[PDB]
Symmetry: C3
Subunit: 455 residues, 3 copies
């Protein structure tokens, strides 16, 4: 039999729909092709990024450990499943003992002997009330949870590799922008030095140009270091070296991702890996509850063997030395100071803990997807405003430069316009990077890229 209680999946303690407001667009509703089914080969349009994600999937050591844990829990489940059948082996027993007079069968001190070679099982637990079967089902649910954990680990690895790639590309763009601005500042400083050496353009302008040049140089060194360290982080995430014949990657100013649907919050209960991991852990706790109650009921043991026995060692395997033993045992606990009841309470408490953790996983998934949706709703406006800011700063800088080539305006306003333009372009690169990272993390939260191609 089985004393495992019925499993009822708890209600999702989240809102029926994703949040709405000044930062959220209209709820799209139920999705035909959910986010978890959109393969990462189609979500990420950059072919070099796709090849890097493949190299990471095949070489990342953390994902390797996450995949091997599934094998380990499968082996543990197979052990627990084997625990049901009798362990049949060959038992070779010998006994030789001296007994005093009052204990020996002859009345005087005597040396008795007894030898046996038998085949059979010792203390086999007949699982009549489903204790070992409940433990086996618990192990099976823990294995399924480990499999879901491996899927979640793959989604996390894909998201992290994409984030590292985009961060390296953004820092390379920043480094190139700093190169260009430093070259412009150095050209301007050389012209101002030529002017200063012939009495024109006071030291003030020369010192101003020198400050600009040195600031650009420091930023150049900083961004060089950042690019090198981003490459290091990408190599670490890949688990292997960067291939030499990578395809041509797409720039930040291009469409890098396919817009992924949000779906309903109920899609997380069936599509997000860690939620299913928590659910399988809950079902494992349920099976453990079953195993714990199986302890109140009678336990049945069987010791059964057949073979040869003799008083002499020379009498072993002789005709007529055959023997067999059949020993059933039934035990029924009557008084366990509170012990079985406390164990059952512990099992119930563990199931409640898994319920709470499953509910919190649902809530965390909801929060992360809602943050991703807020990012999707606001980053378009923020990037458009930053585009317009960079454009207007460029127009202002061009007007100041045209009013400076004519004696109209001075050098300080021109340098201020240059600095504002540089900072605006930096912030534009940063906002692009943040938008892309937010979309990648939303893709990971909705279901990730467990599938390579769209199913």
């Amino acid at each position: 039999c089985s004393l495992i209680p019925d499993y009822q999946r708890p209600e999702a303690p989240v809102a029926a729909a994703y949040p709405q407001g000044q930062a959220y667009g209209q709820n799209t509703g139920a999705a035909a092709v959910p986010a978890a089914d959109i393969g990462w080969r189609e979500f990420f349009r950059d072919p070099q990024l796709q090849q890097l994600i493949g190299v990471a999937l095949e070489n990342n050591r953390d994902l390797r450990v996450a995949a091997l844990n599934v094998e380990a829990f499968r082996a543990q489940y197979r052990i627990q499943r084997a625990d049901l059948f009798p362990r049949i082996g060959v038992d070779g027993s010998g006994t030789r003992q001296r007994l005093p007079g009052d204990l020996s069968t002859t009345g005087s001190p005597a040396i008795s002997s007894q030898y046996g070679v038998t085949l059979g099982t010792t203390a086999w637990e007949l699982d009549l009330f489903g204790r070992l079967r409940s433990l086996r089902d618990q192990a099976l649910e823990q294995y399924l949870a480990t499999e879901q954990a491996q899927r979640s680990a793959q989604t996390t690895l894909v998201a992290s590799v994409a984030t590292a790639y985009l961060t390296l590309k953004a820092d390379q763009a920043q480094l190139q922008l700093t190169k260009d601005t430093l070259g412009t500042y150095q050209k301007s400083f050389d012209l101002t030095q030529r002017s200063y050496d012939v009495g024109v353009a006071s030291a003030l302008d020369l010192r101003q140009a020198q400050t600009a040049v040195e600031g650009a140089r420091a930023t150049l060194a900083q961004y060089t270091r950042l690019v090198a360290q981003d490459q290091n982080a990408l190599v670490l995430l890949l688990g292997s070296g960067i291939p030499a014949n990578l395809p041509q990657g797409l720039g930040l100013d291009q469409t890098l991702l396919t817009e992924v649907p949000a779906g309903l919050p109920s899609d997380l209960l069936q599509r997000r890996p860690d939620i299913l991991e928590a659910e399988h852990q809950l079902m494992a706790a349920n099976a453990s509850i079953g195993a714990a109650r199986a302890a109140f009921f009678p336990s049945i043991s069987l010791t059964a063997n057949a073979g040869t026995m003799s008083r002499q060692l020379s009498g072993l395997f002789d005709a007529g030395s055959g023997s067999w033993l059949f020993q059933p045992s039934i035990n029924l606990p009557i008084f366990t100071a509170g012990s079985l009841r406390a164990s059952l309470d512990y099992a119930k408490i563990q199931k409640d803990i898994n319920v709470a953790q499953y509910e919190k996983a649902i809530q965390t998934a909801f929060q992360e997807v809602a943050d991703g949706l807020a990012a999707r709703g606001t980053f378009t406006e923020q990037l458009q405003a930053q585009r317009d800011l960079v454009k207007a700063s460029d127009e202002y800088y061009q007007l100041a430069d045209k009013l400076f080539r004519t004696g109209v305006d001075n050098y300080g306003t021109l340098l201020a316009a240059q600095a504002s333009l540089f900072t605006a372009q930096q912030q534009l690169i940063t906002d692009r990077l943040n938008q892309l990272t937010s979309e990648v993390n939303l893709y990971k939260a909705l279901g990730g890229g467990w599938n390579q191609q769209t199913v």
Copy 2:
């Protein structure tokens, strides 16, 4: 008996008083009503924040798991306490075996049988030297440590909910400030466009106003996203949806907290939950030391039953088939290659580890409270200086605007004054948020809000 060593609480490896310096006010000394006794209903003056903290206490899943762990460790302690009494059950045993001639009692191959149904205990460990009792005391101290951990978890949850609430309110204030500044910039840009279309006010001023407008727009989008995500984080911390009929909350510019006394560092040894958790873990290690030494002394086992026995199955429960078994056993370890000594060394080492962890908990509490006191000592001056900076920036902006409505000054100085005022107000909001968060974290470090009302 009991071989558990005496417990002596280690001296607090911290200073007798909290640090003093340019950032710390005068030490208040011993507090009449300590910080841990001040309820969170009285520490937090915002009624909406109080209702949110209540909803979080009743719905947060992490606190639910922390409370269920106390139940689980209570069940484990009850199991260990039950382990002391004999496990009395009904044993039904059967035996049927064929023996060869030289081993059977008849001289020829014979099939012997034996059946019994008895009531009693098997291998009951008479806890004469306090091994099981020491294990039970270890389980009890671990349960008390779990209870202290639940209290610490509640304090952490209260602090986190308050921090999320204050962060959401501060970002909403930032969003409103950005709305106002963007409206001002748009009005100014429209006036400058009207002027530019009639020959007055050169393109330079128009491009300047456009840059200001676009920057304000980007900041607006950013703060909208931040407010949405802060609401998401608050909802996650609550474990439930935000109620609709919440009371009227207080603004950041109002008195939100009651100033909490610092007390002496010795108050942490009796009022902070995680320190008591570490202390209970240490006492559990002490009881484990007792259980480990109980192994060198003689162990006593008892197998005692009474019931019916027979050679035939039909002879069971017949008159005259009564039987009883009394089997005492005493074992004394003589030679254990180093095994018992190494186990005792392991127990002593575990107690030393718990001592070190208790001392480090004390030190961490001291460091956190000292950081909170430095924040209390410096944030008043910083906020006053920021108030005066915002005031002087407003005066400068008004003077520039009055010198711009008259042809006196130009547009660039006015826009620079506006930008400085906006940044000063942003920094004022940020400093208010940081002061409030520091005070909340100091309240959590001193003892938290385990009590709802002041005891």
Copy 3:
């Protein structure tokens, strides 16, 4: 015998040499004195920092726990090593039972008794196929891994203490710079107030000076708090109070560290502690594999004792009551539904997990050392550019001040120059701190300071 497989250290899945590029200098190659052998007494030139690192090594509680874990794992290994030898003890057994007629030797209900006091071993497992020896070797490798973990913990503690010291010193430098700039701003504001009260210098300049003063005041309060909290963090890392008679420390503008060689990436396989920890864990998993396969082969048990036995209690220790028991047992598993095979699969999977974790430790070490090398290659240029920026800002500020003491220029340009100089000096202090922290972390990654003096 021993069924443990051969151990082959996996190839390092990292590049043969450290990365090269615009941020990396030329690879130095194999180092005569590797980084791990350079003692921290010689790496850190600040004598006060050396004394603080010593106080931390002697008083930090985390390092104390890391050292006690080595003792605990040594005790566990000693237990596993003791498990090989027979446990010889004194067994005192008594038996008194009533048997019915059909089971007693007299044909009628009879009370039989039997007492014995013997010395010997019970169920001693003759480790013929190396199961207990494999478990002992696994425990030994886990102990060696714990020792390597203690070494890694010491390196981490040294790096953290150095980082805290340098951060406190940098924030103190920032606080002094803010003091000086605030004093200058207050002097200028007092002069501007004197001027304004006599009709000279319009309110605009007065409000400008007031804004500067208030900003400097707020920054002063902030840096005071930061210095106090850095001192708190240093005290926490030390595990004890700061000594009063510390030696004279060196300033940030001095040479604080000795340039440490990078060596080859192959040096990490023999010099970095956590990599050796992972390797010892892998060898422990190998020994566990050996123990798991030892289960397929015959197990041998021995129950052997000698002492006195009698039917009466008065017959104990009487002449002629001597007795001895020799009971060998041999078991050979024949049918284990998949159980032994699944356990062996689990052992192999655990060894593969340890292989993957060892490889990932190697990769992480490579990434951290490469980041340190990029920092070493770029921070010199960045600090030189920041030096030149501070110098040019000082020259520009002096020119503006000389053009302001003469009626030439106004107050706004002078204040802007002052603000730029202050920010440049702040960034210089920050860049110095970051360079020093990067070099300290590179020293920790290459091998740390496990040795006090250079070996």
